[PDB]
Design a protein around this ligand. Structure first.
Ligand code: DAO
Length: 133
């Protein structure tokens, strides 16, 4: 049951995103622009296929996947990763693997807001999105 995640979401708070980007090896100029962007995330379904768009003034991304089925992904910072997205405890958990590394992108609904927790290494970033009508 992915349905309450679906829709258009706007970033309204971000904590420790620079730490997360730095842990991934993102260069300073890119972190600097990304620290001031507020993306829009769009999550849509068609049958078993989810599509997750991230739009901004800086980078855009789009992925499509089936829950529980691995897919190739090229991230906004140009990592080529092996990904899987699954529901776990009602949370949408996206795991990326590359070069023996991993990062998790966990989305949880709290009081109607979409909380995205990004973990790589020891860095833990929390970014809050609010629904657009
Ligand atoms: C230009 C962005 C560079 C850093 C990308 C890091 C990996 C994706 C982070 C996604 C964050 C979000 O969806 O709010």
């Amino acid at each position: 049951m992915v349905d309450a995640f679906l829709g258009t979401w706007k970033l309204v708070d971000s904590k420790n995103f620079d730490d997360y980007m730095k842990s991934l090896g993102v260069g300073f100029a890119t972190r600097q622009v990304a620290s001031m962007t507020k993306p829009t995330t769009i999550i849509e379904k068609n049958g078993d296929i989810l599509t997750l768009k991230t739009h901004s003034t800086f980078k855009n991304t789009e992925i499509s996947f089936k829950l529980g089925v691995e897919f190739d992904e090229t991230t906004a910072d140009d990592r080529k990763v092996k990904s899987i997205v699954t529901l776990d405890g009602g949370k949408l958990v996206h795991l990326q693997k590359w070069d023996g590394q991993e990062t998790t992108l966990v989305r949880e609904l709290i009081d109607g807001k979409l909380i995205l927790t990004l973990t790589h290494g020891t860095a833990v970033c929390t970014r809050t999105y609010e629904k657009e009508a």
